[PDB]
Amino acid sequence: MDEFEMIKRNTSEIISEEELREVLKKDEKSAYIGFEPSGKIHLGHYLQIKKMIDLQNAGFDIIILLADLHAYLNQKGELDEIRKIGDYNKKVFEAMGLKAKYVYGSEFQLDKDYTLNVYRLALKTTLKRARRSENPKVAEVIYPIMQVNDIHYLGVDVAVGGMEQRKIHMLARELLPKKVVCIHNPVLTGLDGEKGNFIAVDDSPEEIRAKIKKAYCPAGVVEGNPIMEIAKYFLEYPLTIKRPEKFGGDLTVNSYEELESLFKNKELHPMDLKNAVAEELIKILEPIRKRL
Amino acid sequence: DEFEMIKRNTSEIISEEELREVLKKDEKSAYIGFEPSGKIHLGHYLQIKKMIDLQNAGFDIIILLADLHAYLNQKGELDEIRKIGDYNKKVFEAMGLKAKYVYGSEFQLDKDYTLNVYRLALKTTLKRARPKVAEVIYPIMQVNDIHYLGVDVAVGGMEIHMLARELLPKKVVCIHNPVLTGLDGEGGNFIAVDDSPEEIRAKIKKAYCPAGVVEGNPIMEIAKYFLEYPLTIKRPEKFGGDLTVNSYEELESLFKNKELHPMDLKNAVAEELIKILEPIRKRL
């Protein structure tokens, strides 16, 4: 088995694998990830929750921070109106198999002790170090220090997130006494190859087939290919690609690796791959769609 | 006339027109924020006199004691800073000020207030402001201070607040007081309101004060901002003898023509300055 390997699987980067190994040995450890409540939960989200579940299976206590305060300022609904969406999100994640504690940013991000720390942090952060991570607003340089403060406040051992905010985690290590292990998940490529290019975990078998069919997917090309990415990150192996007895016949790959190879040497054509991943994804998301 | 009284000895009044309007209202308020200071010098006293004008002009006065700001700049714990602050209050009352005092820490970490700091930062640019992040935040906290205290007038020094006159519903009138030059002419170089007569005379003597030069002359600045006229300036009968100036403009005239020598000016400024500060020092 190995908990380290399970946590590491399908991650872009783990900022200090050696620290994680030390953290895994602790009798008590915790990890968190932030999400702005969202009406639709797509595969990007699901990818990350699967990671939290890996950590959950390794003995970590999970904390999901629901960024309602930020959602309020970005001008989404009212606090109580966002809470409804948040609780919905809570249902989805629970359906995904996550067992976590949920905290709404508004519960603590306006507290005096927390606000006082933002100002302290700001006195030690350069406008450069902060802008790092068409007309710039002040909020942009504040946001990353609030995030560092969240890491301090929630007391976690591990902070999880996409590869995008990987520089926001450089500040934490720089500005807080306790060093936290950062875990970064890959960023999924939009269905078109680049807002309607997402597959929702609760989309219908019809919609999924539809969204998949029109999807970007050059034969031979794997990098930046949304369909391949799905197969690498959600599909179970081995899996068999149903095939015309004349078109080459059934293919039985036992790993994403093999699949990748077949796709590169063009043994497997775009269409044949799409139908496989499509019906395959549909089964994998099925158990979640029901409880929703 | 109240508009003139308020304009008196000010660098600039951002929209006299707006001020003129404010004065019409039956109720109006103005504030200035100070970071508690161990020693109150002529600089502070100059601004308090301005607050006193507004006071006499019917403005309710608010003194914002910047303790939180002090605290964040490692200037000591808060309770210790309130001690210095409470003192400053006594000195401003001894100067004749009648206002309500408020410590920043009492509201600057409140939810409503902090939530308002985040809204403002979402509409302010990282340019129309600006090196540490805090630098670009203070200007937003200030606009928020003006908003929170709900003042019609904000007094301060020459230091981007009409920025507030843009992202705020109520327009505020800004007033910027001139900044004093040091005794040596460059910016432990200042007279304190509570200084002893003998110390004042000492500080005056060594001060930068070129015969005929008025620009940047601290002795002339003291003459223009605190002395009263007609001013009586004694002088040995062999140096022109005693002369009585009825306005600051005449003083400039005399001094600029070397008709008034630095020594004689100093003795008059020092002796008069002393007689003015006394009623205060005689209360602390």
Chain B nearest-CA distance from A117, in A, is 10
Q: Which residue, A285, A227, A290, A291, is CA-closest to A50?
A: A285
Among 3.40.50.620, 3.30.300.20, 3.20.20.70, 3.40.30.10, name the CATH number for the domain at B1-180.
3.40.50.620
| B115 interaction partners in chain A (CB closer than 8 Å) | 110
| First-last CA distance in chain A | 32
CA distances from A274 to A118, A213, A242, A257, B42 (A): 48, 7, 11, 17, 80
Q: Which residue, A281, A246, A277, is CA-closest to A259?
A: A277
Strand order across the B173-177 sheet: B12-14, B173-177, B153-157, B29-34, B60-65, B99-103
Q: Which amino acid is at B5?
A: M
Strand order across the A181-185 sheet: A13-15, A181-185, A158-162, A30-35, A61-66, A101-104
Q: Is B224 in contact with B217 (CB distance < 8 Å)?
A: no
Q: Do domains B1-180 and B181-284 have the same CATH topology?
A: no
Q: Which amino acid is at A47?
A: L
Beta bridge partners of B233: B243
The CA-CA-CA angle for residues B16, B248, B263, to 5°, reads 140
Closest A-chain CA to B137: A138
CA distances from B71 to A142, B64, B79, B88 (A): 20, 15, 10, 17
| A138 interaction partners in chain B (CB closer than 8 Å) | 120-122, 124-126, 129, 136-137, 140
* Token pair of A137 as six digits: 């607003």
Q: Is B137 in contact with B15 (CB distance < 8 Å)?
A: no
Sign of the alpha-carbon dihedral angle for B209, B212, B218, B223: positive
CATH code of the domain occupying B181-284: 1.10.240.10
Q: Is A24 in contact with A4 (CB distance < 8 Å)?
A: yes
Quick check: B125 and A131 CB within 8 A? no
Chain B nearest-CA distance from A13, in A, is 28
Q: Is B281 in contact with B273 (CB distance < 8 Å)?
A: no
Burial class (CB in 10 A: 0-12, 13-18, 19+), B30: buried
- Give the orientation angle of helix B111-121 with respect to helix A139-153, to 10 degrees: 140
Burial class (CB in 10 A: 0-12, 13-18, 19+), B206: exposed
**Cβ-nearest to B132 among A110, A123, A140:** A123
Give the burial string for B208-237 (b: 16+ CB within 10 Å, else e).
bbeeeebeebbbbbbbebbbeeebebebee
The answer to whether the peptide bond before residue A287 is cis (omega within 30 degrees of 0) is: no
Query: From the centroid of its chain, how far is CA A204?
Result: 22
Rounded CA gap, A149 and B141, in Å? 19
What kind of experiment solved this structure? X-ray
Q: Running DSSP on this structure, what letter comes out for residue A164?
A: G
- 3-state per-residue secondary structure call for chain B: CHHHHHHCCCCEEECHHHHHHHHHCCCCEEEEEECCCCCCEHHHHHHHHHHHHHHHCCCEEEEEECHHHHHHCCCCCHHHHHHHHHHHHHHHHCCCCCEEEEEHHHCCCCHHHHHHHHHHHCCCECCCCCCEHHHHHHHHHHHHHHHHHCCCEEEEECCCCCCHHHHCCCCCEEEEECCCCCCCCCCCCCCECCCCHHHHHHHHHHCCCCCCCCCCCHHHHHHHHCCCCCEEECCCCCCCCCEEECCHHHHHHHHHCCCCCHHHHHHHHHHHHHHHHHHHHCCC
Beta bridge partners of B33: B64
Chain A nearest-CA distance from B225, in A, is 36
- Other beta carbons less than 10 A from residue A32's beta carbon: 26
Is A18 labelled as part of a ligand binding site?
no
| A115 interaction partners in chain B (CB closer than 8 Å) | 109, 114
**Cβ-nearest to A138 among B115, B129, B131:** B129
**Cβ-nearest to A119 among B72, B118, B131:** B72
DSSP, residue by residue, A80-129: HHHHHHHHHHHHHHHHHT---EEEEGGGTTTSHHHHHHHHHHHTTSBHHH
The CA-CA-CA angle for residues B25, B29, B34, to 5°, reads 160
- Other beta carbons less than 10 A from residue A268's beta carbon: 22
Rounded CA gap, B139 and B136, in Å? 6
Rounded CA gap, A147 and B193, in Å? 47
Q: Running DSSP on this structure, what letter comes out for residue A234?
A: T
Quick check: A122 and B115 CB within 8 A? no
Homologous superfamily (CATH) for A1-188:
HUPs (3.40.50.620)
Q: Which residues contact B231 (CB under 8 A, 6 or more apart)?
A: B223, B244, B245, B246, B251, B268, B272
The answer to whether the peptide bond before residue B230 is cis (omega within 30 degrees of 0) is: yes
Quick check: A128 and B123 CB within 8 A? no
Q: Is A151 in contact with A160 (CB distance < 8 Å)?
A: no
Among 1.10.3470.10, 1.10.240.10, 3.40.1190.20, 3.40.50.1100, name the CATH number for the domain at A189-292.
1.10.240.10
- Where do the domains of chain A lie? 1-188, 189-292
Rounded CA gap, A131 and A125, in Å? 10
Rounded CA gap, B250 and B214, in Å? 12
